[PDB]
Amino acid sequence: QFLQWCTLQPENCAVFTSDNKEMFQTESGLVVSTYSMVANTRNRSHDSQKVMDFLTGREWGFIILDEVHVVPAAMFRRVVSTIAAHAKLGLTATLVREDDKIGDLNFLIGPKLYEANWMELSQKGHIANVQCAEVWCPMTAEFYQEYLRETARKRMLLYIMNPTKFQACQFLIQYHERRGDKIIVFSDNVYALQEYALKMGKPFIYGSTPQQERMNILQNFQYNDQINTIFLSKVGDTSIDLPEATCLIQISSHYGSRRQEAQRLGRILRAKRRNDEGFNAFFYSLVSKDTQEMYYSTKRQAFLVDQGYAFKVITHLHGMENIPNLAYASPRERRELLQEVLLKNEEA
Amino acid sequence: KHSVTQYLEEIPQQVQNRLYTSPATCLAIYRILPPLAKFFIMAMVFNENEVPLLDLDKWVNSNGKLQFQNAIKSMKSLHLLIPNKSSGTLMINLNPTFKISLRNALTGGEVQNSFGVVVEENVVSLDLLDEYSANKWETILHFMVGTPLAKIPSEKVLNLLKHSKLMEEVNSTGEFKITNEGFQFLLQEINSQLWTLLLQYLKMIETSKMDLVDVLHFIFMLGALEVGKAYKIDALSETQRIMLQDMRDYGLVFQKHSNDSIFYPTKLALMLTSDTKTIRGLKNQDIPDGSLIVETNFKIYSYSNSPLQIAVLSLFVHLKARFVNMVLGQITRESIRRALTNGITADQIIAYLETHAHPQMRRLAEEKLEKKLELDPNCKEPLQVLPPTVVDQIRLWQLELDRVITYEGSLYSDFETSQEYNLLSKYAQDIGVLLWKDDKKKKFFISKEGNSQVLDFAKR
Amino acid sequence: SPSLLTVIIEIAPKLWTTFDEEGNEKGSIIKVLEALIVFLNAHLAFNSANKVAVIAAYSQGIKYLYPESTSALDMYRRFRNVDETLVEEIYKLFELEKKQIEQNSQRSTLAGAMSAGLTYVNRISKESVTTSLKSRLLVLTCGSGSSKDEIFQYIPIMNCIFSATKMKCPIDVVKIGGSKESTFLQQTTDATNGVYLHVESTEGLIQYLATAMFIDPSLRPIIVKPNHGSVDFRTSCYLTGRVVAVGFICSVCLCVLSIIPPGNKCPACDSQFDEHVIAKLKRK
Amino acid sequence: KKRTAKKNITPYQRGIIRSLILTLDCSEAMLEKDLRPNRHAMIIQYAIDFVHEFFDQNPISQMGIIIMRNGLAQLVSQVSGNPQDHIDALKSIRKQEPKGNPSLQNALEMARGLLLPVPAHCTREVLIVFGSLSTTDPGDIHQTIDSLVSEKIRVKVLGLSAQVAICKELCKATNYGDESFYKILLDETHLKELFNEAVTPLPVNKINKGFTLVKMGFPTRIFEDTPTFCSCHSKLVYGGYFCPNCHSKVCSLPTVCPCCDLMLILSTHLARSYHHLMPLKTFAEVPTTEKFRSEDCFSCQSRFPILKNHKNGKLLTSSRYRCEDCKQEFCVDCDVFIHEILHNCPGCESK
Amino acid sequence: ARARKGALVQCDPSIKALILQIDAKMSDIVLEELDDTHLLVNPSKVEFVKHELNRLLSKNIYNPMD
DNA sequence: TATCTCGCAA
DNA sequence: AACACTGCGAGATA
Ligand SMILES: [Zn+2]
Ligand SMILES: [Zn+2]
Ligand SMILES: [Zn+2]
Ligand SMILES: [Zn+2]
């Protein structure tokens, strides 16, 4: 994502994994490594051990670190004693970390010099004003009594499959194309994703998709203007974040990982920077009423208040009643979706 | 608000005239009527002859007829006038006792009642016994709300609060807690509180030896102006004197000691009608003492304070450690959920914050205000004069706990043709009074403005 | 919405005698004084305790009446204090009358009265920033003869008008006297959004007052009660004295002159004109 | 310690009629951050204020607005006597954003073209609100300046935070040499008062020039309401004025008759003029210890006079700033009010 | 002058049906059912209607808030 | 402290 | 001109 945009040539920075065997003890220049390979139980091959031996051999005058808080400081101290380096560097992310042990990694490396003052950073122009909104779509009486009779996961299949959610999705899809804004939808469920991605005519990047079809959509999204609504699972957000699309729609949400969805949503807003005058980055969440997911989605918006982002509530936008292209609006299509969901609950 | 004016019109006509015999009461009730009615009454008072209604219609023009109906309906309800279908027309004229009493009051009448005051050495100091009255009011407020120690000895006052069900407290166990009545008491700042208490004393003190005419005479004579000399001594009925002593106990009378003297005109009776400034051992300086906290961060920043005031604030926010200028408190959905447990609606608190806690939020309400009303048509975006964000959060908590939608108005029918229904619907959309309509049923449940205007257009 | 009604009653004992001279001497200003007291009380009651003020114009100056500048150093009873104080002051003023008072009959200080009253309104409004006062003044004049239209006060009256409009202060006027429409006053009430009332002499105004001199506080949805049309065919020619329609106004002088140019040096500013321009005018 | 003008030494002549052509500055420079929103937004806001004020105090003049974007002068309001048009034009502009460099030369030439129709008795003027530190001219400039001064066109400019030599030359040149008109600002309040002092007519010491009688007539309001009919905008308007001579309706204005083309006014405009011609002598501040006058106000009744011997407090001063000719006191508020809003001196009226 | 007063209720049709069920359970205080989106009720019993609605929603959902 | 995901290595 | 394919630790979790 950056080091080739940066001046770094990866020809010397061999990436070692203990699986991604690379050139150790022969790299003419600097190297890029990872805590898992450097010192962890994930020493699957002796490539990591050879990298550590070479690291001991050469007095590495400096070390670059990224998010060491997650990795315990024990391996850090072990490799500090093993390598006997000249200098290091800590690119921290949190004020308080689990690696603040008796031997602080600060005095192991050096004093503090700068603090990631997010109030200074997140207001001068990068995020382009987060507008956290949650579309309060209605629910139905046939799916509610069948929702209460299900529990232990097989109950989220009745929550996500809602006929008014397709009326709120196709309305926000046609609303963003009139303003000339691309859409980058997100989700959690696998199946429930392909059923909403195939009917709307929106190519998809999901689990176990071949990369020849994965990069073709990125060539039809970054160049072609006909693909302004893409559907990505969890692979297309943790691998490459797009700096375009100032309108984000969240449909499928998982419990517990509401902070992991907050880390995913935060990486998209940080990638979208160009300092525009408006630059209104809209965020929507199609949450159905009296379901167990909207009450966990309030924990996700509570993390955004902790980041300083403003959150507003939108019950319904005055315009969805005038869209005749909303699928599952007729009661016949709502009963056909009920039979398709009742067959999905019988399969799961 | 029980809207004591509604209680006024509640009473029958003959006792209404009984009250109108007292000119000062006439003046005081003149103070209350809507301005339209005020002007019309002042017109009628002098020309000793009834007047056709057509004139009083043509007096008012367009976009202001709503007040015409307000005034006429009010005045008829309290029957200050007598509509007269003399020649099939409308020969309006006041209850002539009202007219004569008022006219006497305007030019030196014989209202010995209103003139019951006495001028003498008013040795009463401004702070002198004013602080005592303020302390009594604070003591009763704390005892009713419930303080750590409630020195409220108003046995009559306690009986009024309990039997009146002033606050949701277990008087059987001695509890004086906030009920819906208690919530309202927490809501009505001064005029609301005094009014609710006066109504409670009225309802409780209504059995025997009432002399309601004398009761209101005494009440309004208290609210009118400083009687001072000879008030308690001379200017009072027997039951009037008893009621005066009771009110003085209730704080509403700042009678001096010695149990026999002229009336002690405490500022509170003034506060009953003034709708003005609210500020009352020997120390108490604060035009903005009340230092509440309320911004866009939904936090409680307090420097200025008042113990009963901050307790009122705590009635919907947590307390952990009282500080020097601050008290540990942060307003959240849980904080107002505390009052939601009492079922307290997030309605009175709105205007309360807009009005109360302002002694510390003067600059806050000024910067929010920004005079963004004349600038509103030009700059179409308000400068958070009345914070909508906080309002939205409060509505969200209220919605989270509620889930029910209701509408005011009345069902309408006899829309015989579709043309009348469609034209009325178009006119309502022009005036924004139609909540909902449908020509298929020829019915809807909205305000009466459209029907009123159509009927007026048809008949005249 | 409190209002500061600042009556301005002028009392010329010359004009007072004219009022006695007019019709019969069937009653002096005393009628007007009493009616004014009552109307003042009425306004004092109408609103939520909104102040008042009164100024006079005697033959040799003006002096306040109600606000009662520092001197020592019934019914609501504030009515009592206002009225008794006013009457004490006015009797004091009537003591201020003699032949030396009879001497300076040259002027008529009404313009000074209006100007000072406006200054007062500004003072009160400025001090009372909170609870902005929708103020508005009045004018009561005993219309006398011996001068069909005194004009040496023409300008200060209009300056009063402009001050009033800027200050947003309607100014209503009641002329009591002969059937001579006080043109400048008429334009004053009409321009500053007021009301004009040319009563006859001896009727007890109180009805006229309380009717058409009480609807200007802060209402204005209500049709004012002004007399017939308020033609703005303004001042007669300075040289001539006949009301002009197709004016002929010089220059930096600004005086309005008739169709009779003296040919040079317009007779209010010494400014000889281009005789070529004179001929151009004469080209008709 | 006093900050007063010593004396007014042209209280004999001003340009009562005017045709001022304000020219704004909408160019990349105006986008820096020195004034609260920017230069530009604050500028346009104050421009609106000045438009209202100027068309009040000089209610017989016209005005036109000119911008300077992308080195071009694009007229945004014809020279016209109706404030609302110019107000709306400025409203429209304020939502649009500057670009290009300020082409002072082009704006100057466009003005000189614009003011040609203005007749001899009317007086011309321009008011450059110059914001940048450069120009970009497609021609000789001193050529234009010479043409200007040939066409008797005074110019006043209000630079922003610097002094530009050419502008100084420009002001010094057209205004008969007497340089006082290139005032530049150092604060926002200074800017407000800058526009305020730009409002008034402009004397220095006028050369003896042609003084000319101008034909004009006054209208009379109309009566009927349903007969709504207009001859200056061709609409239905519930009632207006009549030209005394052309004898055709004209929507409310001091405008020029659109039928026979003669100026229309009521008088109150002439009254404003009178106020500007012959003002008062500046009120004097009475001596602190030598006054011994009445302890009140005169026009008002204020209690702010002195304190009578208070170490430093009484040693300060005696708020008795008293006008000369009537020789009566007046508190500071009254004197400020008289000399600002209403110019009939209270006492000096009465004698 | 025809004006039929009452407690007008407007909501989504599903909630309308639930309200009708509850109201029938508490002896049918609903005065009229104007359409699928409006209801005319006597305001006397609407408060206990809301009370029982709260009771049953607490019974069913129970707010795990997990 | 029990539970998923899920990358990860070959 | 053939190796297998799944175990196993990271973070996170009610
Ligand atoms: Zn027109
Ligand atoms: Zn004409
Ligand atoms: Zn003064
Ligand atoms: Zn003077």
* Nearest ligand by distance to the CA of C120: 3
C-alpha–C-alpha distance, residues E49 and E29, integer Å:
9
Chain D's closest residue to C158, CA to CA, is D271
Spatial CA neighbour of A162 closest among A326, A41, A51: A326
Tell me the shortest Cα–Cα distance from C115 to chain B, in angstroms.
30
In 3-state terms, what secondary structure has residue A273? Answer: coil
Q: Spell out which residues of chain C touch residue B27, defining contact as CB-CB under 8 Å.
A: 45, 76
Q: Please report, as a single letter, which amino acid is at residue D155.
A: V
Asked if residue B211 lies in contact with residue B240, where contact means CB atoms within 8 angstroms, the answer is yes
B403 in A contact zone (CB under 8 Å):
no
Protein residue ranges contacting nucleic strand F, Cβ under 7 Å? A 17-20, 36-37, 42, 44-45, 153, 234-235, 238
Q: Which DSSP symbol is given to D175? A: T
Distance from chain centroid for Cα B427 = 34
Q: Which residues contact D237 (CB under 8 A, 6 or more apart)?
A: D228, D229, D230, D249, D251
Å: A152 CA to F2 C1': 16
Residue A44, CA: closest nucleotide via C1'? Answer: F9
How many angstroms separate the Cα of C52 from the Cα of each of A12, C6, C92, C135? 93, 5, 20, 9
Asked if residue C203 lies in contact with residue C31, where contact means CB atoms within 8 angstroms, the answer is no
Q: In what order do the strands lie in the sheet with B410-412?
A: B444-446, B410-412, E4-5
Asked if residue C38 lies in contact with residue C206, where contact means CB atoms within 8 angstroms, the answer is yes
Q: Which residues contact C205 (CB under 8 A, 6 or more apart)?
A: C31, C32, C35, C39, C174, C176, C199
Chain F: positions less than 7 Å from a protein CB are 5-10
Q: Which residues contact A298 (CB under 8 A, 6 or more apart)?
A: none
Long-range CB pairs of A74-79 (<8 Å, 24+ gap) are A75/A35, A75/A38, A75/A39, A75/A40, A76/A35, A76/A39, A76/A105, A76/A108, A77/A103, A77/A108, A78/A39, A79/A38, A79/A39, A79/A52, A79/A55
Strands A204-205 and A229-232: parallel
B65-77 vs B35-44: helix crossing angle, rounded to 10: 70
φ, ψ of residue C188 to 5 degrees: the values are -65, -50
Q: Where do we find the tokens 């003029």?
A: D273
Q: Spell out which residues of chain E touch residue B402, defining contact as CB-CB under 8 Å.
A: 50
Å: C153 CA to G7 C1': 110
C-alpha–C-alpha distance, residues A209 and A192, integer Å:
16
Exposure pattern of A22-56 as b/e (b: 16+ CB <10 Å)?
A: bebeebeeebbbbbbbbbeeeeeeebbeebbebbe
Of E18, E60, E65, the CB nearest to A295: E65
C-alpha–C-alpha distance, residues C62 and A286, integer Å:
78
Tell me the shortest Cα–Cα distance from E63 to chain A, in angstroms.
9
Spatial CA neighbour of D326 closest among D271, D276, D280: D280
Chain A's closest residue to E18, CA to CA, is A141
C-alpha–C-alpha distance, residues B185 and B1, integer Å:
10
Q: Tell me the Cα Rg of chain B.
A: 26
Of B61, B63, B225, the CB nearest to C76: B225
A313 in B contact zone (CB under 8 Å):
yes
Distance from chain centroid for Cα C268 = 27
Distance from chain centroid for Cα A112 = 29
Secondary structure (H, E, C), chain B = CCCHHHHHHHCCHHHHHHHHCCHHHHHHHHCCCCHHHHHHHHHHCCCCCCEEHHHHHHHCCCCCHHHHHHHHHHHHHCCCECCCCCCCCCEECECHHHHHHHHHHHCCCCCCCHHHCECCCCCCCCCCCHHHHHHHHHHHHHHHHCCCCCCCCCHHHHHHHHHCCCCCCCCCCCCCCCCHHHHHHHHCCCHHHHHHHHHHHHHHCCCCCCCHHHHHHHHHHHHHCCCECCCCCCCCCHHHHHHHHHHHHCCCCCCCCCCCCCCCCCHHHHHHHHCCCCCCCCCCCCCCCCCCCCCCCCCCCCCCCCHHHHHHHHCCCCCCCECCCCECCCCCHHHHHHHHHCCCCCCHHHHHHHHCCHHHHHHHHHHHHCCCCCCCCCCCCCCCCCCHHHHHHHHHHHHHHCCCCEECCEEECCCCCHHHHHHHHHHHHHHCCCCCCCCCCCCEEECCHHHHHHHHHHHC
Chain breaks in chain B (C to N over 2.5 A) after: 280
Within A 71-130, residues with CB less than 7 Å from strand G: 71-72
DSSP assignment of D308-319: S--TTHHHH---
Q: Please report, as a single letter, which amino acid is at residue B204.
A: M
Q: Which helix (H) or strand (E) holds C33?
A: helix C30-46
C-alpha–C-alpha distance, residues D104 and D65, integer Å:
14
Spatial CA neighbour of D268 closest among C159, B441, C200: C159
Q: Please report, as a single letter, which amino acid is at residue D140.
A: D
Q: Is the dihedral of CA B69, B73, B74, B80 positive or negative?
A: positive
Task: List the end-to-end C-alpha distance of chain C, in Å, as a whole number.
Answer: 58
Please tell me chain C's helix, strand, coil percentages from 3-state DSSP, rounded to the nearest 5: 35, 10, 50
Spatial CA neighbour of B264 closest among B280, B251, B274: B251
Mark yes or no for CB contact D213/C109 under 8 Å. Answer: no
Task: Compute the count of residue pairs across chains B and C with CB atoms less than 8 Å apart.
Answer: 35
Distance from chain centroid for Cα E11 = 9
Resolution limit in angstroms? 8.2
C-alpha–C-alpha distance, residues D261 and C40, integer Å:
51
Q: Where do we find the tokens 């082009």?
A: D106
C-alpha–C-alpha distance, residues B185 and A106, integer Å:
58
Spatial CA neighbour of D68 closest among D126, D125, D24: D24
Of C119, C167, C278, the CB nearest to D334: C119
In this structure, what token pair is assigned to residue B380?
């179409």
Strands C248-249 and D214-217: antiparallel
B13-20 vs B212-224: helix crossing angle, rounded to 10: 40
Asked if residue D13 lies in contact with residue D116, where contact means CB atoms within 8 angstroms, the answer is no
Q: Which DSSP symbol is given to A203? A: -
C-alpha–C-alpha distance, residues D282 and D8, integer Å:
9
Strand-pairing partners, residue A131, are: A282
Could you tell me the distance, in angstroms and rounded to a whole number, from the CA of residue D240 to the centre of ligand 3?
A: 41
C-alpha–C-alpha distance, residues B268 and D63, integer Å:
60
CB A302 within 7 Å, strand G: no
Q: Please report, as a single letter, which amino acid is at residue D11.
A: P
Name the experiment that determined this structure: cryo-EM
Q: Where do we find the tokens 């509530």?
A: A313
C-alpha–C-alpha distance, residues C181 and C189, integer Å:
12
Task: List the end-to-end C-alpha distance of chain D, in Å, as a whole number.
Answer: 33
Asked if residue B149 lies in contact with residue B258, where contact means CB atoms within 8 angstroms, the answer is no
Secondary structure (H, E, C), chain E = CCCEECEEEECCHHHHHHHHHHHHHCCCCCCECCCCCEEEECCCCHHHHHHHHHHHHHHHCCCCCC
Exposure pattern of E2-30 as b/e (b: 16+ CB <10 Å)?
A: eeeebbbbbbeeebbebbeebbeeeeebb
In 3-state terms, what secondary structure has residue C176? Answer: strand
Spatial CA neighbour of B194 closest among B116, B118, B257, B280: B280
Chain E's closest residue to B435, CA to CA, is E10
Beta carbons within 10 angstroms of residue C176's beta carbon: 24
Could you tell me the distance, in angstroms and rounded to a whole number, from the CA of residue C122 to the centre of ligand 3?
A: 10
How many angstroms separate the Cα of B310 from the Cα of each of A313, B136, B169, B182, B361? 31, 18, 20, 16, 14
In this structure, what token pair is assigned to residue E48?
């206990």
Spatial CA neighbour of D218 closest among D267, D176, D286: D267
* H helix runs in C96-222, sequence order: 99-103, 110-127, 154-167, 183-191, 206-212
* Nearest ligand by distance to the CA of D248: 2
Counting as contact any 3 or more CB pairs under 8 A, the partners of C are B, D
Q: In what order do the strands lie in the sheet with C248-249?
A: C256-257, C248-249, D214-217, D263-264
DSSP assignment of A116-142: --HHHHTTTTSS---EE--EEE---HH
In chain E, which among 3-62 make CB contacts under 8 A with chain A? 12, 14, 17-18, 60-61
Asked if residue A344 lies in contact with residue A161, where contact means CB atoms within 8 angstroms, the answer is yes
Asked if residue B199 lies in contact with residue B7, where contact means CB atoms within 8 angstroms, the answer is yes
φ, ψ of residue B51 to 5 degrees: the values are -135, 135
Q: Which helix (H) or strand (E) holds D124?
A: strand D124-128
Q: Is C165 exposed, middle or buried (0-12, 13-18, 19+ CB in 10 A)?
A: middle
C-alpha–C-alpha distance, residues A187 and A257, integer Å:
12
Beta carbons within 10 angstroms of residue D129's beta carbon: 24
In this structure, what token pair is assigned to residue B170?
């277990």
φ, ψ of residue E16 to 5 degrees: the values are -60, -45
Spatial CA neighbour of D349 closest among C109, C9, C104: C109
In this structure, what token pair is assigned to residue A273?
């920077």
C-alpha–C-alpha distance, residues B387 and B378, integer Å:
20
C-alpha–C-alpha distance, residues B255 and B250, integer Å:
11
In 3-state terms, what secondary structure has residue C132? Answer: coil
Beta carbons within 10 angstroms of residue D112's beta carbon: 18
C-alpha–C-alpha distance, residues B238 and B246, integer Å:
12
φ, ψ of residue B91 to 5 degrees: the values are -100, 85
C-alpha–C-alpha distance, residues D336 and B7, integer Å:
54
Could you tell me the distance, in angstroms and rounded to a whole number, from the CA of residue D253 to the centre of ligand 2?
A: 13
Domain ranges of chain C: 3-213
In this structure, what token pair is assigned to residue A179?
């303003």
In this structure, what token pair is assigned to residue A72?
């315990």
Query: C3-213: which CATH number, 3.40.50.1220, 3.40.50.410, 1.10.375.10, 3.60.20.10?
Result: 3.40.50.410
Please tell me chain D's helix, strand, coil percentages from 3-state DSSP, rounded to the nearest 5: 30, 10, 60
C-alpha–C-alpha distance, residues A275 and A273, integer Å:
6
A152 in E contact zone (CB under 8 Å):
no
Strand-pairing partners, residue D215, are: C248
In this structure, what token pair is assigned to residue B209?
């030896």
Q: Which helix (H) or strand (E) holds A158?
A: helix A156-160
In this structure, what token pair is assigned to residue A118?
């997010």
Spatial CA neighbour of E44 closest among E13, E5, E4: E5
Strands C52-55 and C5-8: parallel
Distance from chain centroid for Cα D1 = 29
* Nearest ligand by distance to the CA of D280: 4
